[PDB]
Amino acid sequence: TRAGCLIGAEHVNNSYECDIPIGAGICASYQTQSIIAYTMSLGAENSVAYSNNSIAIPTNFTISVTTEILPVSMTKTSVDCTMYICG
Protein backbone atom coordinates (compact mmCIF):
# COMPACT_ATOMS: atom_id res chain seq x y z
CA THR A 1 0.00 0.00 0.00
CA ARG A 2 1.04 3.64 -0.17
CA ALA A 3 1.46 3.66 3.62
CA GLY A 4 3.87 0.72 3.59
CA CYS A 5 3.94 -3.10 3.32
CA LEU A 6 1.08 -4.76 5.15
CA ILE A 7 1.70 -8.38 6.05
CA GLY A 8 -0.86 -10.75 7.58
CA ALA A 9 -3.97 -8.89 6.43
CA GLU A 10 -6.00 -10.28 3.56
CA HIS A 11 -6.70 -7.73 0.86
CA VAL A 12 -10.28 -7.70 -0.35
CA ASN A 13 -12.20 -5.75 -3.07
CA ASN A 14 -15.07 -5.02 -0.59
CA SER A 15 -15.27 -1.54 0.88
CA TYR A 16 -16.42 -1.03 4.45
CA GLU A 17 -16.67 1.58 7.16
CA CYS A 18 -13.12 2.30 8.43
CA ASP A 19 -12.21 0.41 11.58
CA ILE A 20 -8.44 0.51 12.10
CA PRO A 21 -6.84 3.12 9.79
CA ILE A 22 -3.61 2.33 7.92
CA GLY A 23 -3.42 5.39 5.70
CA ALA A 24 -3.90 6.48 2.09
CA GLY A 25 -7.50 5.26 2.02
CA ILE A 26 -6.66 1.87 3.50
CA CYS A 27 -8.23 0.51 6.73
CA ALA A 28 -8.17 -2.93 8.31
CA SER A 29 -10.61 -4.94 10.39
CA TYR A 30 -11.23 -8.34 11.91
CA GLN A 31 -13.90 -10.03 9.82
CA THR A 32 -15.51 -13.49 9.43
CA GLN A 33 -11.92 -15.40 10.86
CA SER A 34 -8.96 -13.13 9.91
CA ILE A 35 -7.72 -9.56 9.56
CA ILE A 36 -8.56 -7.96 6.23
CA ALA A 37 -7.46 -4.83 4.43
CA TYR A 38 -9.67 -2.70 2.22
CA THR A 39 -10.22 0.70 0.74
CA MET A 40 -12.56 2.45 3.12
CA SER A 41 -15.78 3.86 1.78
CA LEU A 42 -17.00 7.14 3.16
CA GLY A 43 -20.64 6.29 3.77
CA ALA A 44 -23.63 4.68 2.11
CA GLU A 45 -24.64 6.26 -1.17
CA ASN A 46 -27.94 8.11 -1.25
CA SER A 47 -29.81 9.48 -4.21
CA VAL A 48 -32.16 12.25 -3.17
CA ALA A 49 -35.40 12.10 -5.16
CA TYR A 50 -35.01 15.61 -6.49
CA SER A 51 -37.39 17.12 -8.99
CA ASN A 52 -38.61 20.67 -9.74
CA ASN A 53 -42.04 20.03 -8.07
CA SER A 54 -41.45 17.55 -5.24
CA ILE A 55 -40.88 18.14 -1.56
CA ALA A 56 -40.39 15.78 1.37
CA ILE A 57 -42.05 16.82 4.61
CA PRO A 58 -41.67 15.00 8.00
CA THR A 59 -44.97 13.66 9.32
CA ASN A 60 -43.35 12.65 12.66
CA PHE A 61 -40.23 13.46 14.75
CA THR A 62 -38.16 12.15 17.61
CA ILE A 63 -36.33 13.72 20.49
CA SER A 64 -32.69 12.84 20.69
CA VAL A 65 -30.18 13.45 23.38
CA THR A 66 -26.52 13.47 22.52
CA THR A 67 -23.55 13.86 24.78
CA GLU A 68 -20.68 16.25 24.24
CA ILE A 69 -17.65 15.93 26.47
CA LEU A 70 -15.21 18.82 26.82
CA PRO A 71 -12.04 19.29 28.94
CA VAL A 72 -12.03 22.43 31.04
CA SER A 73 -8.89 22.24 33.14
CA MET A 74 -5.49 20.62 33.72
CA THR A 75 -3.95 19.39 36.94
CA LYS A 76 -2.31 22.40 38.56
CA THR A 77 1.24 21.24 38.96
CA SER A 78 4.01 23.32 40.46
CA VAL A 79 7.67 22.53 40.34
CA ASP A 80 10.35 23.79 42.56
CA CYS A 81 13.21 23.79 40.17
CA THR A 82 15.84 24.28 42.79
CA MET A 83 14.85 21.16 44.60
CA TYR A 84 14.20 19.35 41.39
CA ILE A 85 17.53 20.18 39.87
CA CYS A 86 19.70 20.01 42.95
CA GLY A 87 17.80 18.76 45.97
Partner 1 sequence: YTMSLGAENSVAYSNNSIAIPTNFTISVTTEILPVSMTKTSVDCTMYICGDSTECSNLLLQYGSFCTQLNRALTGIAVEQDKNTQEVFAQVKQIYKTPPIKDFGGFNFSQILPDPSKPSKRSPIEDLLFNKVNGLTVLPPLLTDEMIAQYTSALLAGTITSGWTFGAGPALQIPFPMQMAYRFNGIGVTQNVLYENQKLIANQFNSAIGKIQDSLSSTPSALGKLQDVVNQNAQALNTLVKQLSSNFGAISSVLNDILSRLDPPEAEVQIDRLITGRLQSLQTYVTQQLIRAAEIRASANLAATKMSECVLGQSKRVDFCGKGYHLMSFPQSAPHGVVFLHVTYVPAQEKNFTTAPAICHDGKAHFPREGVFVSNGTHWFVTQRNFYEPQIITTDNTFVSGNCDVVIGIVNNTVYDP
Ligand X SMILES: *[C@@H]1O[C@H](CO)[C@@H](O)[C@H](O)[C@H]1NC(C)=O
d(CA 20, CA 27): 5
The strand pair at 10-11 and 34-39 is best described as parallel
Options 18-26, 27-35, 50-58, 64-72: segment touching ligand X (CB under 6 A): 50-58
Q: Does 20 bind ligand X (CB under 6 A)?
A: no
Q: Does 13 bind ligand X (CB under 6 A)?
A: yes
Please, what sign has the CA dihedral across residues 38, 41, 44, 50? negative
Q: Where does this chain bind partner 1 (CB under 8 A)?
A: 2-3, 18, 21, 23-25, 27, 40, 42-75, 77, 79, 81, 84-87
